[PDB]
Amino acid sequence: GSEAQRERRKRILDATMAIASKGGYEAVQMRAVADRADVAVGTLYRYFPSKVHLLVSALGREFSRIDAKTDVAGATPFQRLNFMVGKLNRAMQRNPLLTEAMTRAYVFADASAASEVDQVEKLIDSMFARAMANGEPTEDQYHIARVISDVWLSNLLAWLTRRASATDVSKRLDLAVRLLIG
Amino acid sequence: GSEAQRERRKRILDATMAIASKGGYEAVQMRAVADRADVAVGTLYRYFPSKVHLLVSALGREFSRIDAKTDVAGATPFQRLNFMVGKLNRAMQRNPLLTEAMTRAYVFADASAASEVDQVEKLIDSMFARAMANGEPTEDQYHIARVISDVWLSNLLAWLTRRASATDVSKRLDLAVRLLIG
DNA sequence: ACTATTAGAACACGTTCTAGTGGG
DNA sequence: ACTATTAGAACACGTTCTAGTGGG
């Protein structure tokens, strides 16, 4: 049934977030996800043809949910963008290893998951973009939002690998947005 | 001997670049690298404790060599930065699958290779930074160079996965540098 | 006595395959 | 007749281990 099929898609991704929150990218093992979901490994692959597609699908729905709750505080597009980069940078650091697994999956994917990846990318831009205009944004506002998305993925990626501290990431984010709004 | 040891380090990485140029990240197989280098898999791991450390070491020495040849054309720091982002963006597209293997390795590494990764990152910044000042750069010039490094890794990463075309990558690069120099 | 190296078995996990079973 | 699902064997490759060998 399609209702049960949807139910085990949600059970598979919910399992993925549970395991990733506990042990990161190295703990999201396909057999363990298919266990905690009570599905066969063959089923788990039927729903997600790879590990990468799995975790970037879970990132897809995480950012989808966060955008849903996000759809404000700021009289300047500068302070609004700072508010979104602070909201998301703050949240992704709440579950460091869940963030690690999903972000590394998103960043190491190849063309096979391009679609999924692209979707996530778009969403993030939209958020930052909708932060700046407080609505339907400009072309230049989607541009800046795009570059900022890059800078945040780069910095978040550095913090996932102990290459940067929370203070370093905050510095480079505030500085990126400050130079992109001259 | 240390001379022979160095010789097989160079043979291992040269093998890595050869195989990656032919078949990308999925073709850089440890057994195949240890074959083409005439070393044991146990030796290959003695020199590089993982696949990731291997290919990001090869990226380390690729960017080291490119920086060595780079160490100009432009009366404006804008046109100089455009010249470096064009030089590197142009070169990395000469061997698309070698670029794919090394860039994905650099982007999917964890803390174990952080050092190596960090080194590469620094080098790239330096290049862009030295492009702008035409020498010892400012703090703000290293800043902009840093953000541009992010934007280029992001875009190059999108082009490696058929998510963006060469024209798209060129657009977003020129636009990033144009908004970072207002 | 030392430590690097080698060929290969061995192990882990991502992915696929096989045969059998259950649900619409 | 259909197609999803299941448990598990099977295969590939990254990584480690074992025993034996070579070089300073």
CATH number (domain holding residue A59): 1.10.357.10
Closest CA relative to residue B117, chosen from B177, B172, B54: B54
Q: What is the largest CA-CA distance in chain B?
A: 55
Cβ atoms within 10 A of the Cβ of B95, count? 17
| CA B70 – CA B87 distance, rounded (Å) | 10
In this structure, how many other beta carbons lie within 10 angstroms of the beta carbon of residue A78?
14
Q: Which nucleotides of chain C are near protein (any atom < 7 Å from a CB)?
A: 4-9, 13-19, 23-24
Q: What is the 3-class SS of B14-34, one letter each residue?
A: HHHHHHHHHHCHHHCCHHHHH
Where would I find the H helices in A50-138? 51-69, 77-92, 96-108, 114-133
Method for structure elucidation: X-ray
Q: Which long-range contacts (C-beta less than 8 Å, at least 24 apart) are formed by B68-72?
A: B70/B127, B70/B130, B71/B130, B72/B134
Taking CB atoms and an 8 Å cutoff, what residues of chain A touch B118?
Answer: 163
Interface of B with A (CB under 8 A): 25, 104, 107-111, 114, 117-118, 121, 140, 143-144, 146-147, 149-151, 153-155, 157, 160-163, 172, 175-176, 179-180, 182
Structural domain count of chain A: 1
The experimental resolution of this structure, in angstroms, equals 2.9
At B109, the amino acid letter reads A
Burial class (CB in 10 A: 0-12, 13-18, 19+), B119: middle
Q: Between the CA of residue A94 and those of A91, A164, B147, B174, B181, what are the distances in Å?
A: 5, 16, 25, 35, 34
Closest CA to B152 of B171, B135, B137: B171
Burial of B70 (0-12, 13-18, 19+ CB in 10 A): middle
Tokens of A59: 């990132």
Secondary structure, 3-state, A24-54: CHHHCCHHHHHHHCCCCHHHHHHHCCCHHHH
Separation between Cα atoms, residue A78 and residue A8, nearest integer Å: 42
Q: Which of chain B's residues have a Cβ under 8 Å away from the Cβ of A103? A: none
Domain interval for residue B135: 1-182
How many Å lie between the alpha carbon of B179 and the closest alpha carbon of chain A? 6
Number of H helices, E strands in chain B: 9, 0
